[PDB]
Amino acid sequence: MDERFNAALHESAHTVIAQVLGFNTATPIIYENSSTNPDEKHWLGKAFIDTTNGNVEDIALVGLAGEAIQYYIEGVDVGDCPFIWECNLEDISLSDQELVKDLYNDVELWEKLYTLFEQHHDSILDLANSI
Ligand SMILES: O=C([O-])C(O)C(=O)[O-]
Ligand SMILES: [Cl-]
């Protein structure tokens, strides 16, 4: 459940940031991985977010949000998030990388994301507690 709640926070951060930026969403889901491969996560998640229309930087904020909520909770400095993201790329999903591309280097987006977390972490927790 310790790892399950982190899978929950991840999808909830994606979802709430998307909502704050005006993107349509449906409630995300959390489910157990049946794989016996030690290199895979045991708890998986899926988000349902319309990123078809949106601007590149807003989509990147949604893409960053999943891993970012942990950086925020753990106290990583905004200016250090680009390095931290790059170091963890092998463990960041390809779909998040597709939404972000190289905008993880943008310290102003990280500053913005942290500000949104500051203002909406309660909504993030409420959603995570419900999935
Ligand atoms: O692949 C993912 O990161 C996730 O399942 C999603 O696309 O919502
Ligand atoms: Cl909202």
Ligand SMILES: [Cl-]
């Ligand atoms: Cl919505």
